Amino acid sequence: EVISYGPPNVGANENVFGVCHIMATWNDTFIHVTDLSGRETLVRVTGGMKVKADREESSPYAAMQAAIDVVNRCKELKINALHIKLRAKGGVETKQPGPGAQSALRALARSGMKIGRIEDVTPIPTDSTRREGGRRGRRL
Amino acid sequence: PVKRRNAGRSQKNRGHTRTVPCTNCGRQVAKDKAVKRYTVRDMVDPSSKRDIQQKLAFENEKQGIPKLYVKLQYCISCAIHSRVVRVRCAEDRRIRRPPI
Amino acid sequence: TEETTKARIMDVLGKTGSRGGITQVRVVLISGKEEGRQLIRNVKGACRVGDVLELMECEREARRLR
Amino acid sequence: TQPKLFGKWNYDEVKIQDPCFQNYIACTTTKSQVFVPHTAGRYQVKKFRKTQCPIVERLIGTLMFHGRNAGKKALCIKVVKNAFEIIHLVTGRNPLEVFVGAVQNAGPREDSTRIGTAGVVRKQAVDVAPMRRVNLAIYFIIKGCRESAFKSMRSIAETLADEIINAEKNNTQSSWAIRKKDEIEKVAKGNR
Amino acid sequence: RTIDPLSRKEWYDFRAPIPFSSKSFGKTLVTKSSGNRIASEEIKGRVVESTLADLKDNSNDKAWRKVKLVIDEVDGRNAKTSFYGLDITRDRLCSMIRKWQTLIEARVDCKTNDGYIIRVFTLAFTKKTSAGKQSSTSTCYAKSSQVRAIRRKINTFITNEAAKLGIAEFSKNLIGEDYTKKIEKETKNIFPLQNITIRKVKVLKRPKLDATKIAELYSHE
Ligand SMILES: [Mg+2]
Ligand SMILES: [Mg+2]
Ligand SMILES: [Mg+2]
Ligand SMILES: [Zn+2]
């Protein structure tokens, strides 16, 4: 039958908590579940996995497909609920999460996954090394 | 023809002010000159909000979804192009606390 | 996935689309699974107040106009 | 005496259910029970007047098309009555119940459109009004009719009857109207 | 599917230390013992980032306090944890950050009698009295000197309240609202302060736990 190599003893009352690190870039999206430690990785999905076009990598369609794959795969690991840690590229780069951010967050719960505590961890310089732009930034 | 008396930057009583990279481009801009708007938005479309608030595991949340805090700093070319700020007539040009 | 809800228009709000071909509308649901819920929807075609609308998702809610 | 359509078809046997259509499809009214589909009505002077026009007259209107057939109404009244006869010969129930059934059952609900908002340009998921739903229903049904009957031996009455029945039956193979309906609704679902 | 990748994985229940609920909070995954790899020993150093989802009664309002725990021990398929760190959500921070007041920050280094070296960061804000809405006009700043005296005072008090307590004690006090009350009472002379906060706690140097003290940390009612 079904041998789920996820946790031994559960109940219908019980909550099984995984953690979802979600990275949204203008160029892509990452939906990554692990345990509460962050050490042992459970599921991994990138937009680029879900589409063949380099430009679509970030898009909501891709984020959605990614999400549903993740959910389907947690479901058999017996995982009800993910905590969410959201991230943009951050550091010296932009701190605005990409387009896939919202879409993936939604599609996760849309898929009948409970949702735990939500935090934004975007890397935040106390202070920075110097930015990849020119002195004058991107012209055009 | 001096255009602004301010000359665009809020700086007086000093020689030099720290330069900030523009959010949009990354061009260095004066911290006085920069068009800076602090943004508290929500991470999620209101519809998407409904969907998530259904599935929130801890019912002890009252507005228990975080807001997204941005300190947004625009170089001038960017904040003009991007409509954050836009061209106004000479008289209005000096108006200081405008919004709603 | 086939699941459907009848949606009746309370108010015609805006007019929208690139060409301006769509109407924005406020809606009360009659399904019986979700009753009296209100939504904001973008409808193509010509609409009055108090029409009925066939809605495939009561989750998608249209971005309001400014 | 309650007039029957063409004299052989009772309007009293047609009941509409889906609450969107009851205001948008004519046949309920004393004014819409007509022996002949030909009103010579003013149905286009104001926005929603088209609603008060008898559905069969509406269909006839859609039929009158292409440069050569423009403004020949008698022809289409014939075609419609005949198709209705063939319909009662196939199903055996009020060809009206089949028609109305097939206007209801085939036409889009979701459709996709460009909504410019600032920078966003891409198709968006939009819902179809009752009036447009009906209008489109008829447009489609008849377009399928033409495409099929063009160089074939099958007449318009025949093609149209075929189409009306398939259209109520929901057949996605045999009904052009439903081919397009499903295609559109799929384009739409994909564009959300 | 062929050979589910988690085939070799054993699960462990996390157990929280003396200030927190004895009930397990989360669960962790680890690979089975290989005859070289000893299952329990691969987990000796792992680090758990949680809210207070960990204090049953008091939890629900504080989603704002992050607690790091580190696994000192494996007992029988469930992993015991000792104190590692304290912290704060982005939200609960940028929540508190307002223009037109002074942002005070105070960093301290202290020793427990428990044998721990800790680093505590404190946060505080200028409290407006004058009864208007704080604004460009309603400027609240405190003089830099007053800030300095405030640091000196906070810092001192913490080092004192640190040296006299165990890490159990210290952490319990730290999480809760006790120190905020006291700190306001010290600080008020220099300047009225608003939402005093312990921004973060780091554990610099942690001794290894004898079976005794790790038993006494467990001690759950
Ligand atoms: Mg670049
Ligand atoms: Mg100079
Ligand atoms: Mg003053
Ligand atoms: Zn710029």
UniProtKB/TrEMBL annotation, chain A:
One of its GO terms (cellular component) is ribosome. Belongs to the universal ribosomal protein uS11 family. The keyword Glycoprotein does not apply. Keywords: Ribonucleoprotein, Ribosomal protein. GO terms for molecular function: structural constituent of ribosome. The lineage of its organism: Eukaryota, Sar, Alveolata, Ciliophora, Intramacronucleata. GO terms for biological process: translation. Residues 128-140 have a biased composition (Basic and acidic residues). This is Rps14e. It comes from Tetrahymena thermophila.
Automatic annotation (TrEMBL), chain B:
Keywords: Metal-binding, Ribonucleoprotein, Ribosomal protein, Zinc. GO terms for cellular component: cytosolic small ribosomal subunit. Residues 1-17 have a biased composition (Basic residues). GO terms for biological process: translation. Belongs to the eukaryotic ribosomal protein eS26 family. GO terms for molecular function: metal ion binding; mRNA binding; structural constituent of ribosome. It comes from the Eukaryota. This is 40S ribosomal protein S26. Zn(2+) binds at C22, C25, C75, C78. The chain holds residues 2 to 101 of 119 of the full protein. Residues 1-23 are annotated as: Disordered. It comes from Tetrahymena thermophila.
TrEMBL record, chain D:
Keywords: Ribonucleoprotein, Ribosomal protein. This is 40S ribosomal protein rpS5e. It comes from the Eukaryota. Belongs to the universal ribosomal protein uS7 family. One of its GO terms (molecular function) is RNA binding. The keyword Ribosomal protein applies. It holds the Pfam family Ribosomal_S7. PROSITE patterns: RIBOSOMAL_S7 (PS00052). It comes from Tetrahymena thermophila. InterPro entries: Ribosomal_uS7 (IPR000235), Ribosomal_uS7_CS (IPR020606), Ribosomal_uS7_dom (IPR023798), Ribosomal_uS7_dom_sf (IPR036823), Ribosomal_uS7_euk/arc (IPR005716). GO terms for biological process: translation. The lineage of its organism: Eukaryota, Sar, Alveolata, Ciliophora, Intramacronucleata.
UniProtKB/TrEMBL annotation, chain E:
One of its GO terms (cellular component) is cytosolic small ribosomal subunit. Belongs to the eukaryotic ribosomal protein eS1 family. The keyword Mitochondrion does not apply. GO terms for biological process: translation. It is found in: Cytoplasm. Component of the small ribosomal subunit. Mature ribosomes consist of a small (40S) and a large (60S) subunit. The 40S subunit contains about 33 different proteins and 1 molecule of RNA (18S). The 60S subunit contains about 49 different proteins and 3 molecules of RNA (25S, 5.8S and 5S). This is Small ribosomal subunit protein eS1. The lineage of its organism: Eukaryota, Sar, Alveolata, Ciliophora, Intramacronucleata. Keywords: Cytoplasm, Ribonucleoprotein, Ribosomal protein.
